[PDB]
Amino acid sequence: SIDEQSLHNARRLFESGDIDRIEVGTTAGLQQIHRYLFGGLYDFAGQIREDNISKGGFRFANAMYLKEALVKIEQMPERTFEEIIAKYVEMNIAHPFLEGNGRSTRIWLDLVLKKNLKKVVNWQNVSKTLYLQAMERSPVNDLELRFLLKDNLTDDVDNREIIFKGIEQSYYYGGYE
Amino acid sequence: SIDEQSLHNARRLFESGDIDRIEVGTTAGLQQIHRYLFGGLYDFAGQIREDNISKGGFRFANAMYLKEALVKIEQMPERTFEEIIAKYVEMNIAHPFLEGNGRSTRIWLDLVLKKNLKKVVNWQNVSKTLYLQAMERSPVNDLELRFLLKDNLTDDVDNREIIFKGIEQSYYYGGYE
Ligand SMILES: Nc1ncnc2c1ncn2[C@@H]1O[C@H](COP(=O)(O)OP(=O)(O)NP(=O)(O)O)[C@@H](O)[C@H]1O
Ligand SMILES: Nc1ncnc2c1ncn2[C@@H]1O[C@H](COP(=O)(O)OP(=O)(O)NP(=O)(O)O)[C@@H](O)[C@H]1O
Ligand SMILES: [Mg+2]
Ligand SMILES: [Mg+2]
């Protein structure tokens, strides 16, 4: 039900045009996204975590230096696809919230791609299994992730079907329907 | 041959008493150890790396925020075995040099244990296979490492056989003889 309400928030972010007022490629902008999706649902919406977390055998950036890491991550360049993916990979390693990192940071990635390349990821055609494998591998080698995403870019960045079917797939990655 | 010369340096560190002049539990003290073992052998002896490195599927702390991470890691408490191991685990995640992290940081760990608990690890009885597995797991859960090391502590901290057979085993962990 938390997931269902945040899915409505995600849809409203785009329907309302509020997506166009989110700061692009910064820590604050990621926090804006997270606050929009999870405000009133998670107590920690928008807030940088103070606890440590791991998933599938990988420990995300230690909370004691997470703030410092985010200051450096947000300054990374965004000129090319390769640089943008590298920045995304580091933001994923940071994993700045207790929950909802995946959904918020994918929206954050699309904004950076859209601003710098005039493209976004056509998530509806990006397999859950291949996406999750590629993300798990990305800290060591982002080849899997680059191969996957580059083949699924679209320049039709405001198309309703791409946007809304993409949001649905994004939520599916986290286990919702 | 680099390994053989640094093994002589490691032995001399203890034989000479120079070990007693190394700063305990700090980043600078780890750099002193590394400089002592590898000075004149690696160009980067004592120097915090600027490149990224991974091993066995784990990416060590990103070079762009490594300095910041080390400032926080060195401030971690050292009062109990559990705290000391937690500090060691984070220093291993930092992996501040291009090479020689294992050998230098194990000496660094013994100094912290010796200062705070009046014990050191009896490395000669600590299996290579179990040690390397336990270190690989430690970022997610340090249970393996704690179980292994706690069973192999000794209060005979200046005993020549414990020290020199321990150095030999430490070098063996890295693949030397
Ligand atoms: N072992 C791992 N290493 C690196 N990244 C991972 C790992 N496991 C999961 N991830 C990423 O972390 C994200 C999940 O973080 P989480 O805070 O659960 O976000 P979410 O929005 O709640 N769920 P999701 O829809 O899966 O992104 C996923 O998008 C994965 O790509
Ligand atoms: N996948 C991993 N995750 C976490 N730590 C690891 C991993 N692989 C190796 N290590 C640790 O990293 C150390 C090796 O770092 P390195 O810079 O090669 O030091 P070294 O002194 O040259 N060799 P060693 O004698 O094995 O410690 C080892 O002591 C391991 O315990
Ligand atoms: Mg989640
Ligand atoms: Mg080595």
Residue numbers in the entry:
A (entry chain A), B (entry chain A): 13 to 189
Pull verbatim passages from the article behind this deposition:
The ubiquitous FIC domain (pfam 02661) found in proteins of all domains of life and viruses has only recently been shown to confer ATase activity. The vast majority of Fic proteins are characterized by a conserved HxF[D/E]GNGRxxR active site motif and catalyses adenylylation, an enzymatic activity that involves nucleophilic attack of a target hydroxyl group onto the α-phosphate of ATP. Helices α4 and α5 are joined by a loop that together with the N-terminal cap of helix α5 forms the active center represented by a signature motif with the consensus sequence HxFx(D/E)GNGRxxR. For the comparative structure/function study on the inhibitory mechanism of Fic proteins from the various classes we chose as representatives the FIC domain of VbhT (residues 1 to 198) from Bartonella schoenbuchensis in complex with its cognate antitoxin VbhA (VbhA/VbhT(FIC); class I), Fic protein SO_4266 from Shewanella oneidensis (SoFic; class II) and Fic protein NMB0255 from Neisseria meningitidis (NmFic; class III).
